[PDB]
Enzyme design. Structure first.
Site, mmCIF file in Angstrom:
data_model
loop_
_atom_site.group_PDB
_atom_site.id
_atom_site.type_symbol
_atom_site.label_atom_id
_atom_site.label_comp_id
_atom_site.label_asym_id
_atom_site.label_seq_id
_atom_site.Cartn_x
_atom_site.Cartn_y
_atom_site.Cartn_z
ATOM 1 N N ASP A 1 0.856 -1.254 -0.053
ATOM 2 C CA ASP A 1 0.095 0.168 0.016
ATOM 3 C C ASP A 1 0.665 1.208 0.075
ATOM 4 O O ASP A 1 1.551 1.533 0.933
ATOM 5 C CB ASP A 1 -0.847 0.138 1.327
ATOM 6 C CG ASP A 1 -1.800 1.291 1.245
ATOM 7 O OD1 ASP A 1 -1.930 2.218 0.324
ATOM 8 O OD2 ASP A 1 -2.488 1.756 2.448
ATOM 9 N N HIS B 1 -4.577 12.983 13.874
ATOM 10 C CA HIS B 1 -5.605 12.837 12.926
ATOM 11 C C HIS B 1 -6.723 11.800 13.397
ATOM 12 O O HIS B 1 -7.764 11.814 12.683
ATOM 13 C CB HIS B 1 -5.103 11.902 11.644
ATOM 14 C CG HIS B 1 -4.215 12.879 10.724
ATOM 15 N ND1 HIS B 1 -4.436 13.941 10.454
ATOM 16 C CD2 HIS B 1 -3.023 12.592 10.324
ATOM 17 C CE1 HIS B 1 -3.408 14.363 9.730
ATOM 18 N NE2 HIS B 1 -2.715 13.640 9.553
ATOM 19 N N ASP C 1 2.943 20.029 12.873
ATOM 20 C CA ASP C 1 2.937 18.980 11.833
ATOM 21 C C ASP C 1 2.503 19.697 10.624
ATOM 22 O O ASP C 1 2.014 20.505 10.553
ATOM 23 C CB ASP C 1 2.065 17.876 12.221
ATOM 24 C CG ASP C 1 2.252 16.383 11.304
ATOM 25 O OD1 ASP C 1 2.936 15.662 11.849
ATOM 26 O OD2 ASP C 1 1.773 16.611 10.190
ATOM 27 N N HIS D 1 0.503 18.210 8.403
ATOM 28 C CA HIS D 1 -0.764 17.710 8.161
ATOM 29 C C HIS D 1 -1.839 18.485 9.151
ATOM 30 O O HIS D 1 -1.466 18.763 10.413
ATOM 31 C CB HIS D 1 -0.993 16.420 7.985
ATOM 32 C CG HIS D 1 -0.250 15.624 6.943
ATOM 33 N ND1 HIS D 1 0.947 15.096 7.104
ATOM 34 C CD2 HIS D 1 -0.570 15.214 5.802
ATOM 35 C CE1 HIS D 1 1.513 14.757 6.061
ATOM 36 N NE2 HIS D 1 0.326 14.561 5.340
ATOM 37 N N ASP E 1 7.411 16.299 9.514
ATOM 38 C CA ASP E 1 7.208 16.325 8.067
ATOM 39 C C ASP E 1 7.069 17.571 7.628
ATOM 40 O O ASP E 1 6.876 18.092 6.363
ATOM 41 C CB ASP E 1 5.870 15.520 7.521
ATOM 42 C CG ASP E 1 4.621 15.729 8.678
ATOM 43 O OD1 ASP E 1 4.628 16.331 9.277
ATOM 44 O OD2 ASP E 1 3.992 14.684 8.250
ATOM 45 N N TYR F 1 9.289 11.974 7.955
ATOM 46 C CA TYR F 1 9.245 10.523 7.151
ATOM 47 C C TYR F 1 10.703 10.700 6.460
ATOM 48 O O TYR F 1 10.991 9.544 5.899
ATOM 49 C CB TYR F 1 8.057 10.559 6.220
ATOM 50 C CG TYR F 1 6.998 10.595 6.903
ATOM 51 C CD1 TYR F 1 6.405 9.331 7.792
ATOM 52 C CD2 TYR F 1 5.998 11.591 6.997
ATOM 53 C CE1 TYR F 1 5.397 9.402 8.488
ATOM 54 C CE2 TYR F 1 5.129 11.619 7.772
ATOM 55 C CZ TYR F 1 4.574 10.265 8.356
ATOM 56 O OH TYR F 1 3.483 10.527 9.314
#
Ligand SMILES: O=C(NO)c1ccc(Cn2cc(CCO)c3ccccc32)cc1
Ligand SMILES: [K+]
Ligand SMILES: [K+]
Ligand SMILES: [Zn+2]
Length: 631
Positions: free
Chosen positions: A22, A137, A174, A176, A267, A307
């Site tokens: 994935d 999240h 972050d 996101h 990130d 990451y």
């Protein structure tokens, strides 16, 4: 009274991983955890931290932010085979499940509460939790984007319940959007959520309209959700700092949080395949440092994303460094935020105006490596008037060489023909600057002084030849200090009581109108002084205070934040012995916690402040918090 920094980590949390093909989840690997602890180990930082063990979160704690039916279904995954784990993961967006993940989720959660408890029990001053999986999240009845349970949501709910807190600030830097955290505290005015995040006009994941700046919270909590959407990739240090100086910090100091929690995902850093921003790791030293004057330093950093196995460790190390109080690296090349960032900053500032004071007046890869940050042996040299002696924290000290002493003789004959106990002030000024600029032994210092003019001049001139390429001078007084600002190697911040129209763009001269005076100072400190100082990038800060001149409430905050400039090399020249002022200056210089603050500034004051922004932002673009009018 609290000392040290907690590092909560446990290798067990890297013992789950994606088990099927994935490309959405490949990036979230166990190595993110082992790389970051190894990076902390290599640089001596983890060793310098109070290791606090991991615990599981109890079911009762998990129910604080999650629904029983969701908890029940996750509870069933340790018994699933791989075909079954794939099906359960497909019920969610961008998340995989592993036989050990429910286990490590309870560890990631419990590690956060441990950190909350350590910080709140005064056992450490701050700390950081290296955890997997991330949290921000995660929502009340679903996993999402590698998150199982909302680790940072827990911390705040848990600190509300168990310490009766009224005001928590969550900073989610972050890349996101932490939508699980927004949802969870949407109507809650006791939890202030700030998130910047890559948005690209809703086209970037998770693709939420609520992720936009229009979301300010709901019901009794509107104004306590602050979304800052990045609509372009490649944001830079200058963009991030603009976001802090013109959005987050002004709100955060007004909020006065009793506890600060960071969704620290990295990130947001250069090289990250997902974030695609351009901020250097070093920026995270300042991100951290700029919040430490809040909640008396009680800050709980918690790992989210990040990451690039290389961009990751460097930003971890920069955060822990500042948590431990080590000198911040100089950030060079700063300037205006790009126009997309100015747009976002402009919009978010405008919709928030109806709820905050600082904004209220507008409603009328390959990079280089991050050097090394050697902690200073004696952080702060103190030089009180002769005879008087005081109690000094363990990283402070008192006062002269012959080489030093002839140079005072040299300077006497050349510049001060009529010359007592001032040729002691001058003699120490040199040895402290010599100790600061030469050895990385003494880091900053403070010296009580008799004559201003002879001492500031000797100080500044001795600093320019140290060499200090540039000296930021911040003076609290009404005279005219012998500081020429023609050459542009000196910038001067004057905080006086008498209006004195500045002519040129290397001086900033503020005259405040008395109860107002504290909240006026802080807006100017975050809105004007800090943006210019950071663009200027000085090699040394020169602090000066006049005997004559309510600046006992703010000096600690300014002495703390201004150490983000010049590797923390400040030299404070105090005129007249004042037991509380010296004790306060030395405390801030040496790295102690700054005690919190608490009336919105006078309208004549916000008015003068943006006169100064207008007059100065063409030269000092980090001052800008709107898009530029184009001819
Ligand atoms: O770090 C995070 N949250 O804190 C986080 C990171 C990524 C995702 C989901 N996702 C995965 C990829 C794979 C590309 O390499 C991708 C690409 C574009 C947008 C979204 C994408 C969820 C959460
Ligand atoms: K964020
Ligand atoms: K909220
Ligand atoms: Zn992220």
């Amino acid at each position: 009274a609290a000392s040290g920094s907690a590092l909560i980590f446990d290798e067990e949390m890297s013992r789950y991983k994606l088990l099927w093909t994935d490309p959405e989840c490949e990036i979230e690997v166990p190595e993110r955890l082992t790389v970051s602890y190894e990076a902390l180990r290599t640089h001596g930082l983890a060793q310098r931290c109070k290791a606090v063990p991991v615990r599981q979160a109890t079911e009762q704690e998990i129910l604080l932010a999650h629904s029983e039916e969701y908890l029940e279904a996750v509870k069933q995954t340790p018994g699933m085979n791989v075909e079954e784990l794939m099906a359960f993961s497909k019920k969610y967006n961008a998340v995989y499940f592993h036989q050990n993940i429910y286990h490590c989720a309870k560890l990631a959660a419990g590690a956060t509460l441990q950190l909350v408890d350590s910080v709140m029990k005064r056992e450490v001053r701050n700390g950081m939790a290296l955890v997997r999986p991330p949290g921000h999240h995660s929502q009340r009845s679903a996993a999402n984007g590698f998150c199982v349970f909302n680790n940072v949501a827990f911390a705040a709910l848990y600190a509300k319940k168990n310490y009766n807190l009224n005001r928590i600030l969550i900073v989610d830097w972050d890349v996101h959007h932490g939508q699980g955290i927004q949802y969870c505290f949407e109507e809650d005015p006791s939890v202030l959520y700030f998130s910047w995040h890559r948005y690209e006009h809703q086209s970037f994941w998770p693709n939420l309209p609520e992720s936009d700046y229009s979301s300010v919270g709901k019901g009794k909590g509107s104004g306590f959700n602050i979304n800052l959407p990045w609509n372009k990739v490649g944001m830079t240090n200058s963009d991030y700092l603009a976001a802090f100086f013109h959005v987050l910090l002004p709100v955060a100091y007004e909020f006065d949080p009793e506890l600060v929690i960071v969704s620290a995902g990295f990130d947001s850093a250069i090289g990250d395949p997902e974030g695609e921003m351009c901020a250097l790791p070093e920026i995270f030293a300042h991100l951290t440092h700029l919040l430490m004057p809040l909640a008396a330093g009680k800050m709980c950093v918690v790992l989210e994303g990040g990451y690039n196995l290389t961009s990751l460790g460097q930003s971890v190390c920069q955060t822990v460094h500042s948590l431990l109080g080590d000198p911040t690296p100089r950030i060079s090349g700063l300037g205006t935020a790009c126009d997309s960032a100015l747009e976002s900053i402009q919009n978010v500032r405008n919709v928030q105006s109806s709820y905050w004071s600082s904004f209220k007046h507008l409603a009328q890869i390959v990079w280089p490596e991050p050097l090394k940050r050697m902690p200073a042996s004696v952080r702060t040299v103190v030089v009180p008037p002769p005879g008087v002696e005081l109690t000094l924290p363990k990283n402070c000290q008192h006062s002269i060489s012959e080489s030093t002493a002839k140079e005072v003789q040299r300077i006497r004959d050349k510049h001060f023909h009529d010359l007592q106990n001032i040729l002691r002030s001058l003699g120490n000024i040199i040895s402290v600057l010599d100790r600061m600029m030469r050895s990385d032994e003494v880091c900053n210092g403070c010296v009580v002084v008799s004559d201003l003019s002879v001492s500031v001049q000797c100080a500044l001139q001795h600093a320019l030849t140290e060499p200090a390429e540039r000296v930021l001078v911040v003076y609290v007084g009404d005279g005219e200090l012998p500081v020429k600002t023609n050459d542009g190697k000196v910038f001067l911040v004057q905080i006086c009581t008498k209006e004195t129209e500045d002519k040129c763009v290397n001086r900033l001269t503020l005259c405040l109108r008395g109860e107002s005076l504290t909240a006026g100072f802080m807006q100017a400190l975050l809105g004007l002084i800090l943006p210019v100082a950071y663009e200027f990038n000085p090699a040394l800060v020169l602090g000066i205070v006049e005997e004559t001149a309510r600046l006992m409430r703010v000096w600690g905050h300014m002495t703390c934040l201004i150490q983000g400039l010049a590797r923390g090399r400040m030299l404070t020249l105090l005129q007249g012995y004042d037991k509380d002022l010296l004790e306060l200056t030395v405390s801030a210089l040496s790295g102690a916690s700054i005690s919190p603050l608490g009336r919105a500034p006078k309208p004549e004051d916000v008015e003068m402040m943006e006169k100064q922004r207008q007059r100065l932002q063409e030269r000092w673009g980090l001052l800008r918090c709107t898009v530029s009018e184009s001819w």
